[PDB]
Ligand binder design. Structure first.
Ligand SMILES: C[C@@]1(CC(=O)O)C2=NC(=C\c3[nH]c(c(CCC(=O)O)c3CC(=O)O)Cc3[nH]c(c(CC(=O)O)c3CCC(=O)O)/C=C3\N/C(=C\2)[C@@H](CCC(=O)O)[C@]3(C)CC(=O)O)/[C@H]1CCC(=O)O
Ligand SMILES: NC(=O)c1ccc[n+]([C@@H]2O[C@H](COP(=O)([O-])OP(=O)(O)OC[C@H]3O[C@@H](n4cnc5c(N)ncnc54)[C@H](O)[C@@H]3O)[C@@H](O)[C@H]2O)c1
Ligand SMILES: Nc1ncnc2c1ncn2[C@@H]1O[C@H](CSCC[C@H](N)C(=O)O)[C@@H](O)[C@H]1O
Ligand SMILES: Nc1ncnc2c1ncn2[C@@H]1O[C@H](CSCC[C@H](N)C(=O)O)[C@@H](O)[C@H]1O
Ligand SMILES: [Cl-]
Ligand SMILES: [Cl-]
Ligand SMILES: [Cl-]
Ligand SMILES: [Cl-]
Ligand SMILES: [Cl-]
Ligand SMILES: [Cl-]
Ligand SMILES: [Cl-]
Lengths: 451, 449
């Protein structure tokens, strides 16, 4: 990331502002409200500084920059109109390791000031890093509409209850169930805003009085095929709120960046399958919220059935969030719809990785008016070619292979059936094989990239 | 206000973490993402730390906390399970005026780590000062859903391409409407993200050429089968920047509630709008220079005629894109406890529609999960002809009606009972044929209605 956002306690801590005009003023107001012990060192001062100095709210130092003023300081702000003076202030601060903002110069400061949406004690800060000040302000206002004014009264009450919530709940997993109920009780929010105390207490005592469900849970979540925009709303919720995320390798890194930062991640795979099952079951028995995060959809060649059947009579609550399967993701992003008027009456989602002694039913697969989609079929493209031709599929039937579909790394090779073996040599997994006349639609429908 | 948020530039600045467990490891990773010159001092380290040390990415000091490690430090984090150590650390940090966090003790610290939505260089931070971390996390989740993944790319390209400064826009009012066009153009954004810079300046100079009021594009968004939580993030983002939403009735009311409050709505469904009318409504509304979202149940390219709808816009020079959706097969499969595949049960899932006939001999072959879209009418012919063409009569069947919705109904039995099990359900309904259906009584986690 460009920056690390932090929230500083500035109460009773020395801060220095060099500069005395309109920019200096605005930053000083900020620092005063955070409780900084503030000195302002400037050649000249606009009247607001006189106001503040006369009522004992800051110290004014009238004259050129005095770097010894930095000596006791946690933060410094260079707000003069003189680039030279500002750079001297910046240098002096770096030597002392004091975080420094240079108002005219986002790239040269050691911190920048964010735009602040204030719902104290709840605060939202947004910044483009100085690159895009207009985007920040349009975000700033969109955030404003989204955050109810009274959210502060809810967050304020939460802090007052924290001691009581720590005493009455011994676990920290039971404390989460209480807060999750607390923060979405609309009547409680309302009664706080109306300062209706008897209503606040009535709802509050009921909340405390509620037997919490101690059982854990397992949720199979489909990550989709890679593009993180293709995660579902509910999938996002589960991974934002999970205690532990068990995940395989076809889950994308961008999707992993959406996991609760505070949650335990457990990788499986490139681990046997019955291994995975018990990892979940004992972990859900242990009372924690477990997400099995799976590539694409969990019930299309994900073995999600296997992972769940372990839990049915083991009394473990479970649930399933479907995901965008590879055929759907690769259909959309290659410009190759899986159906179209009648090019196809069927879509066949077919595995290539078959049993110890399993053979696909080629005679059936070669039938006309369908879109074939092979999962896990890279290493048998030549066999797929040879069999489909032998059971009637025309030689010039168009095919496509989508490698890393929906990713910024997505590659699409295509051609006709007698090239399928050759084409497959030009991709690595994960790749999907699409066979059918809809592959020709690519050139009119392909919207996402030429790779 | 009780804490001042600032955005620290940490690239190659010395920071210290004290502790070497899971907690310290999470903080180390965040500080690494920010490019800190990271030292980690702990009595023992979990493996992740020594991996990080072997790839040159940080420095480890094995042993008790030594406060001279703070000597050239900009930021300090106390992440041990030992309050005595954490106090020693934060105290050592305060006398040096090094901003310090005690992970576990928000007011021991001199700073708090907020929740972070990272769209670098664009960033959002959420904190309540230690009073409401769950609330902070709830707000992170929603901001993650609302902020596109590659807004950052656009952020970068923006500050740079203002070389066309006032160029053609002298009014702050004119400019901020160009920036409005600019930051929500998600095609520019993915073309940036994909590095396709022929598609960049394509989309770029259209933005600088076309009239400033004009925003003409079409997005096919799949709404999934009805549960509003099955919209994708990008689905949501798109239906929130729409000028005009064209929706079709297989779009649930819950999904429509998420639609932009100020978007226009055109209901193209039944009460029977033929396809061509739809195909030019989209065309027309996009010709007017409006950001058009066409909402469709499930996934647009699976029996949705999505391709037909894009054939219109293709040669009209109107940009389009597609956001796939959860198709009814997946949604019904997940919410009914019937996986489309399981072990050796099925080598292939068949999504099939209810001029021409269906190849019953092929539908009848073994080791398939058959999924019948729009087949409630034909449910009796289906039953008849599947048995006639050799499918074993005991084959489990299930019909899922309004799958994923708060009124979904699952009625199941055996191929003999297919036609009559259909009278119990109304459109929209899926017919599932195959041995996977039997797992329902072991995997039914939704509530049947
Ligand atoms: C942002 C993030 C750091 C990061 O970015 O990595 C950080 N912790 C994360 C989330 C989170 N951590 C925990 C919970 C469950 C809490 C619950 O149930 O109440 C959650 C919420 C959740 O996600 O469920 C365990 C925990 N944490 C704290 C306590 C209480 C205490 O210590 O007093 C307890 C439980 C002890 C108990 O159960 O008793 C303290 C804090 N948690 C805050 C945020 C800070 C002030 C919050 C504010 O003032 O509003 C602060 C002081 C940490 C700091 O400043 O370092 C990261 C968000 C990642 C994301 O958003 O994805
Ligand atoms: N690119 C843009 O379009 C853009 C973006 C942001 C801001 N701006 C403008 O730039 C303006 C800057 O002007 P200002 O508001 O600061 O008014 P100002 O002229 O009063 O600020 C100068 C201040 O710097 C101090 N100063 C100068 N030399 C000094 C020295 N050697 N030691 C100590 N202090 C010294 C003085 O106290 C003086 O008050 C802002 O008002 C803002 O509107 C323009
Ligand atoms: N992004 C992607 N692009 C192309 N193929 C992918 C893919 N992600 C997964 N696949 C395919 O999925 C196979 C794994 S089987 C798991 C598939 C997943 N459950 C789904 O519903 O899509 C891989 O062999 C590969 O063929
Ligand atoms: N919520 C739902 N529950 C069960 N079946 C549904 C459904 N929504 C759509 N369908 C099925 O889809 C048919 C309409 S055709 C449109 C399908 C859509 N493109 C998709 O991906 O799902 C209906 O006849 C019904 O069989
Ligand atoms: Cl900015
Ligand atoms: Cl936005
Ligand atoms: Cl499977
Ligand atoms: Cl078709
Ligand atoms: Cl179709
Ligand atoms: Cl079978
Ligand atoms: Cl029907």
């Amino acid at each position: 990331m460009d920056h690390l956002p932090i929230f500083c306690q500035l109460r009773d801590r020395d801060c220095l502002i060099v500069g005395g005009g309109d920019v200096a003023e605005r930053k000083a107001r900020l620092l005063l409200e955070a409780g900084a012990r503030l000195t302002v060192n400037a050649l000249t001062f606009i009247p607001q500084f006189t106001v503040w100095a006369n009522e004992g709210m800051l110290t004014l130092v009238e004259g050129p920059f005095d770097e010894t003023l930095l000596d006791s300081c946690w933060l410094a702000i260079a707000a003069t109109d003189d680039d030279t003076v500002n750079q001297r202030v910046s240098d002096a601060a770096e030597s002392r390791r004091i975080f420094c903002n240079v108002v005219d110069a986002p790239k040269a400061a050691s911190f920048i000031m964010p735009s602040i949406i204030d719902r104290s004690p709840l605060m939202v800060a947004v910044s483009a890093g100085g690159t895009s000040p207009v985007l920040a302000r349009l975000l700033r206002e969109k955030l404003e509409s989204l955050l109810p004014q009274h959210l502060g009264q809810v967050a304020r009450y939460a802090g007052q209850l924290r001691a009581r919530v720590k005493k009455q709940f011994a676990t920290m997993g039971e404390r989460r169930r209480f807060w999750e109920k607390f923060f979405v009780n609309d009547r409680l929010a309302q009664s706080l805003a109306n300062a209706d105390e008897k209503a606040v207490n009535a709802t509050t005592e009921r909340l405390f009085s509620e037997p919490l469900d101690h059982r854990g849970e397992v949720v199979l979540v489909g990550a989709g095929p890679g593009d993180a925009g293709l995660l579902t709303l509910k999938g996002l919720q589960q991974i934002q709120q999970a205690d532990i995320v068990v995940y395989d390798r076809l889950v994308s890194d961008d999707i992993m960046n959406l996991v609760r930062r505070d949650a335990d991640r457990v990788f499986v795979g490139k681990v046997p399958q019955e291994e995975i099952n018990q990892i979940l079951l004992r972990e859900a028995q242990k009372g924690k919220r477990v997400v099995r995060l799976k590539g694409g959809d969990p019930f299309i060649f994900g073995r999600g059935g296997e992972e769940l059947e372990t839990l049915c009579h083991a009394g473990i609550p479970f649930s399933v969030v479907p995901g965008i399967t590879a055929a759907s993701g690769c259909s959309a992003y290659s410009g190759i719809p899986l159906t179209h008027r009648d090019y196809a009456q069927s879509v066949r989602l077919v595995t290539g990785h078959l049993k110890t002694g399993g053979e696909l039913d080629w005679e059936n697969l070669a039938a006309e008016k369908q879109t074939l989609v092979f999962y896990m079929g890279l290493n048998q493209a030549a066999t797929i070619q040879e069999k489909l031709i032998a059971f009637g599929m025309q030689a010039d039937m168009p095919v496509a292979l989508v490698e890393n579909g929906t990713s910024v790394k997505q590659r699409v090779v295509h051609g006709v059936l007698t090239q399928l073996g050759e084409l497959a040599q030009q991709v690595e997994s994960p790749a999907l094989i699409i066979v059918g006349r809809v592959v020709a639609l690519r050139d009119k429908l392909n919207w996402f990239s030429n790779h």
